[PDB]
Amino acid sequence: MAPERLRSRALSAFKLRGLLLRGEAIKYLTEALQSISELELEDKLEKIINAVEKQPLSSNMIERSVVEAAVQECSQSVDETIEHVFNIIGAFDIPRFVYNSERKKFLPLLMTNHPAPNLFGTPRDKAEMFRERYTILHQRTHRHELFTPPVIGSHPDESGSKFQLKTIETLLGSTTKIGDAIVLGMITQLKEGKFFLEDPTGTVQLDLSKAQFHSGLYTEACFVLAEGWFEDQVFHVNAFGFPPTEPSSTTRAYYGNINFFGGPSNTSVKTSAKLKQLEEENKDAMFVFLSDVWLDQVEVLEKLRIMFAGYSPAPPTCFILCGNFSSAPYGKNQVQALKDSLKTLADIICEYPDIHQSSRFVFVPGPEDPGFGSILPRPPLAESITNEFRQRVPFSVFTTNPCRIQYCTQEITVFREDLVNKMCRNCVRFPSSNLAIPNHFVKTILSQGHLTPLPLYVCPVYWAYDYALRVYPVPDLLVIADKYDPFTTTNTECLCINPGSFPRSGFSFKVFYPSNKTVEDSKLQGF
Amino acid sequence: RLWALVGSDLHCIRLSIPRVFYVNQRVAKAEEGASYRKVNRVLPRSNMVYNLYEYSVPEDMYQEHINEINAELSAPDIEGVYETQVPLLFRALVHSLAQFSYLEPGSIRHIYLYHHAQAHKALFGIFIPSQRRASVFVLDTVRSNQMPSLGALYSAEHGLLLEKVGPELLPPPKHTFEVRAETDLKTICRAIQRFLLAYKEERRGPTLIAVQSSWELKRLASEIPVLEEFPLVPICVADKINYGVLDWQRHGARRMIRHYLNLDTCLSQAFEMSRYFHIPIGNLPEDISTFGSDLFFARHLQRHNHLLWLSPTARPDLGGKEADDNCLVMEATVEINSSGCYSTVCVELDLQNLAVNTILQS
């Protein structure tokens, strides 16, 4: 085709749509379109212009990179992809949204006055953690059926389905011995035995002589609906309860499909037709999850060899190895032992090259593993430890703890901490045994909407990064890796699972199939 | 397995003890013993002030039956959640016991051996008083052999202290030698296994192996099977020798032959330590050496019963930790800085052993 007419028509095609091409962009475009004639040229131009406009364009002027991506997408090249299909997101990479009350909308921080998060936070940020936790739970609470009736919704007035809400500052006043007060607030043992409630407006004593408590494991720093009456600067509790939990369908139906989970997608990955198709392109799309994988033990390494033997047929897309990787985490000794662990793991992986090229391997280190273990979100394992594994197994990613894994349209959260024991020791009211403890824990986590519903000295967190620990909206998987007990539970279209601790589960572990969201037990105890 | 001394070299028996868990409940939860006996050991409940629990009276008890907890954590002495773990070692039997004076732990016959090594020159060392055959077996300079293994393994030097600390050895010490050698990964350990199994039958089979040091590859546990006891004859790694190894004026006379007398040194040291806490040949001293203080303190905390002690990798004997109490760990030394000199003297004083002096006043 004539280069001058091809250039003129391509420039005109972009110009009529209001787009300007730089010299490199138009040159590359003419080279890419040189093999096409008038039977296809204009349709090709319209298609690639649509591909350009789909991208996050910041200006009418187009660099060569944008048209490169557009024409490559027009030429496919996304067949059997891993990008857009499987992402591991570090906790520091999660977008920092903030809920604005006047707009009643989540805004990204670039659209606000909020500063960037950093470890050495201000005195304000320490309060901002709990203030934002209250804010998210507050906007969650007021959208429940407890909301006031509409305009003459009932001929007699109703008290918000008998669940009308108030804050602490409102009842510090004329409302003495009002028998129907309900307040959202944080439980605190602000004096020993003399518990208090707190919200962003103020504080008040809790007379919890009767608790009448709904199922859930109550601790200090838990936010609760305290139902009771007020007298003598004391809130006399009639009942305690958590705020009701939302499904992600409800949350995204209200706020739209914002990508709260993070990752490359601008929208929530749960709503995408192409990604819905790519999720099911492999009927046995599959992942494996383990924890406390003590590779400083020869026994763990040999049993891992047997597990690779067992999953040579139908290998996963990725193996997920949660942390506390060591029998003996005790410093320099374990730095060298983890180097040896990863050398031996690379040897084993090269002894199964089919699994090496078929599966990825990701690591979520625990609080006891070497490095900045004790404060969350933990950074990844030290790069000097990983370096040989980086070059010998490029099909692997050491990442933060917690980390967010996305597989196509589904949301997986991975977090290593022995939190059930922490929660039950910081318990305010010993729960009823009729519901199992992992169900109590999962209900508490989902209702509190946070991975660490405990005081800061119980769960040390970098203050400005506390949003990364937030469970909101509810994901597809809560992979809470914990010594306590391997388990599987579910609520609000999530499956909340624990792979246990591999040396103490008798070397049992978990398997997950996102194509049908099923979970299977690797019951390989005699392996 | 308990290893002990008849008039011959050694004898042994297989035994077990009820390994205490302070389960802290027989009332609702129970197992095959109602062992709420004689509740007195108050110190874990006192250690737990770092963990902050109330009313905390001492204990309730039962055997370690399985590798799993009663997760419905509770107690009848006063209700709460507790460690319950203690029995990290067995120190005396339960189901007869002597006074354990006159412990006289020196068995008479043994083979002598040594493991210290360069990666390229590994010095597997046989050298004994009866047999003149010795060894410096293997090196990765395969074209040659370790040269001082004759002319300095033969020390040409017998120390006068041999005649003083000698009665713990049956034949007199004797330090003239000849050697043999090998080089292949298949042959060294396998051959030495066969050698030592045959060597012991010169003394007749049941014997200790007096390994003078295990500085190579921690060849104390990582050795081929012993068939009987491994005593803690190895010296700690004091001579951290990693140079080119042929400097045997020290690396042969002192490192090999004078460290024969370190048999008598280490063993007599361990024996006289056992006079104070009755564990001779498997005792911790010259390592961190805490077992003297730890086990005396434990048995005194049995005399007035308080606690047999836990020992995690970190410090304490208690559960969940409030970090505010750790802030002291997270974070008198005055310099009066008289840069003028006034009542001119040799300005000086120096003070020692102040820690053991401190405790006396309270």
UniProtKB/Swiss-Prot annotation, chain A:
GO molecular function, one term: DNA binding
UniProt KW keywords: DNA replication, DNA-binding, Nucleus
Family matches, as InterPro entries: DNA_pol_a/d/e_bsu (IPR007185), DNA_pol_e_bsu_N (IPR024639), POLE2 (IPR016266)
Gene Ontology CC terms, in alphabetical order: epsilon DNA polymerase complex; intracellular membrane-bounded organelle; nuclear body; nucleoplasm
Keyword Magnesium belongs to the record: no
GO biological process, one term: DNA replication
Any Pfam family hit: Dpoe2NT
Localization, UniProt: Nucleus
Protein role: Accessory component of the DNA polymerase epsilon complex. Participates in DNA repair and in chromosomal DNA replication.
Misc. remarks from the entry: In eukaryotes there are five DNA polymerases: alpha, beta, gamma, delta, and epsilon which are responsible for different reactions of DNA synthesis.
Subunit and partners: Component of the DNA polymerase epsilon complex consisting of four subunits: the catalytic subunit POLE and the accessory subunits POLE2, POLE3 and POLE4.
Family designation: Belongs to the DNA polymerase epsilon subunit B family.
Name of the protein in question: DNA polymerase epsilon subunit 2
Organism: Homo sapiens (Human)
From Swiss-Prot, chain B:
Lineage top rank: taxon: Eukaryota
Compartment annotation: Nucleus
Assigned protein family: Belongs to the DNA polymerase type-B family.
Record's disease association: Colorectal cancer 12: A complex disease characterized by malignant lesions arising from the inner wall of the large intestine (the colon) and the rectum. Genetic alterations are often associated with progression from premalignant lesion (adenoma) to invasive adenocarcinoma. Risk factors for cancer of the colon and rectum include colon polyps, long-standing ulcerative colitis, and genetic family history. CRCS12 is characterized by a high-penetrance predisposition to the development of colorectal adenomas and carcinomas, with a variable tendency to develop multiple and large tumors.
Domain comment quoted from the record: The DNA polymerase activity domain resides in the N-terminal half of the protein, while the C-terminus is necessary for maintenance of the complex.
Quaternary assembly: Component of the DNA polymerase epsilon complex consisting of four subunits: the catalytic subunit POLE and the accessory subunits POLE2, POLE3 and POLE4. Interacts with RAD17 and TOPBP1.
Main function: Catalytic component of the DNA polymerase epsilon complex. Participates in chromosomal DNA replication. Required during synthesis of the leading DNA strands at the replication fork, binds at/or near replication origins and moves along DNA with the replication fork. Has 3'-5' proofreading exonuclease activity that corrects errors arising during DNA replication. Involved in DNA synthesis during DNA repair. Along with DNA polymerase POLD1 and DNA polymerase POLK, has a role in excision repair (NER) synthesis following UV irradiation.
Name this protein carries in UniProt: DNA polymerase epsilon catalytic subunit A
Organism: Homo sapiens
Lineage, broadest ranks: Eukaryota, Metazoa, Chordata, Craniata, Vertebrata
Protein's gene: POLE
Residues shown, of full length: 1346 to 1742 of 2286
